[PDB]
Amino acid sequence: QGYDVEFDPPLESKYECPICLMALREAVQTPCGHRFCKACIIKSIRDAGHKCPVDNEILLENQLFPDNFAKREILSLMVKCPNEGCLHKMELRHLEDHQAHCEFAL
Amino acid sequence: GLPRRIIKETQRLLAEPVPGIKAEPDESNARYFHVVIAGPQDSPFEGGTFKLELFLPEEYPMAAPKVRFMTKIYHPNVDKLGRICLDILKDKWSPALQIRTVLLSIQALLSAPNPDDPLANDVAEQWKTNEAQAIETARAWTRLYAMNNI
Ligand SMILES: [Zn+2]
Ligand SMILES: [Zn+2]
Ligand SMILES: [Zn+2]
């Protein structure tokens, strides 16, 4: 459930979600310092244990800090339309808007 | 048709394969992989080519990848059916671990057996008492089952 898109330049591994391997969507950070997509670490906590998947350290859902710096810079990254065929590229922050105007789509 | 996580993870392995290990998806079902691990050096399995089958359950990455040896092998962490007794594949697994993580673990397990985590009854203990004997038997099995690269 992260951002399944081509990042060009490629996505830096610091912004990749260990759980879904996509760019962090709604980045959050754990007390232990790891980042996930807000929705992925909740999914891991709810049915995998209240531990951080990266090191099995106790985690708990009320300890997910919004990683506002990561969210900000990931949304400013250049990406390509993931509608296969389309050849449009823009700041990830705007991908969504572009969707309402894609030649390839719904 | 197959989850992006599996799709992306696959490309990375084929792209940057783990040293001493060759693994490709099933040309008929991506959830299955055909693995070949070269016996570690200085280890009892030196000079042998081992085949394993790794399968990714539907609950993956929440549930661990099931792996099994296809090539017979004398080692305290593998049973007669070829099943591997390893922590990270049982309770110590995490949706954060990957296929590469499993491949690397199994390989280290050859370079140096872990006689308890838990362990496949038999060999497990024989490797404890007559470790010299256990090792010659493993070398023997390696020449017998993993030297004709079937
Ligand atoms: Zn952690
Ligand atoms: Zn994620
Ligand atoms: Zn488009």
Tally of helical segments of chain B: 4
Overall shape of chain A: elongated
Domain module count of chain A: 1
Structural class label of chain B: alpha+beta
Rg over alpha carbons of chain B: 15 Å
Major β-sheet strand ordering of chain B: 1-2-3-4
Shape of chain B: globular
| Largest interface in this structure | A-B, 13 and 11 residues
CATH superfamily of chain A: Zinc/RING finger domain, C3HC4 (zinc finger)
Order of helices and strands of chain A: EEHEHEEH
CATH class of chain B: Alpha Beta
Query: What name does the CATH topology of chain B carry?
Result: Ubiquitin Conjugating Enzyme
Largest sheet of chain B: 4 strands, antiparallel
What is the second-level CATH architecture of chain A?
Answer: 2-Layer Sandwich
Task: Please work out how many helical segments of chain A DSSP would assign.
Answer: 3
Quaternary status: heterodimer
Q: Which molecules are bound besides the chains?
A: zinc ion
Identify the CATH architecture of chain B: Roll
Strand content of chain A: 5-15%
The helix content of chain B is 25-40%
Q: How far apart, in Å, are the first and last alpha carbons of chain B?
A: 32 Å
Write up this protein.
The complex is a heterodimer of chains A (106) and B (150). The longest helix of chain A has 9 residues, at 38-46. In chain A, a hairpin with an 8-residue loop joins strand 4 (78-80) and strand 5. By secondary structure, chain A is α+β, with helices and mostly antiparallel strands. Chain A has a single domain (1-106), classed as Herpes Virus-1 (2-Layer Sandwich), CATH 3.30.40. In chain A, the strands form 2 sheets. A 3-stranded antiparallel β-sheet of chain A has the order 2-1-3. Chain A has helices at 38-46, 68-74, 92-99, and strands at 27-29, 35-37, 65-66, 78-80, 89-91. The two termini of chain A are 19 Å apart. By secondary structure, chain B is an alpha+beta fold. Chain B has one domain: Ubiquitin Conjugating Enzyme, CATH 3.10.110. Chain B has 4 helices and 4 strands, in the order H-E-E-E-E-H-H-H. In chain B, helix 3 crosses helix 4. Chain A binds chain B through residues 4, 18-22, 44, 47-48, 51, 53-54, 56, and chain B through 4-5, 8-9, 61-62, 92, 94-97. The complex binds zinc ion (3 copies). The PDB classes it as signaling protein/ligase. The entry lists the keywords cross-brace, beta-beta-alpha, Cytoplasm, Metal-binding, Isopeptide bond. It forms a dimeric assembly.
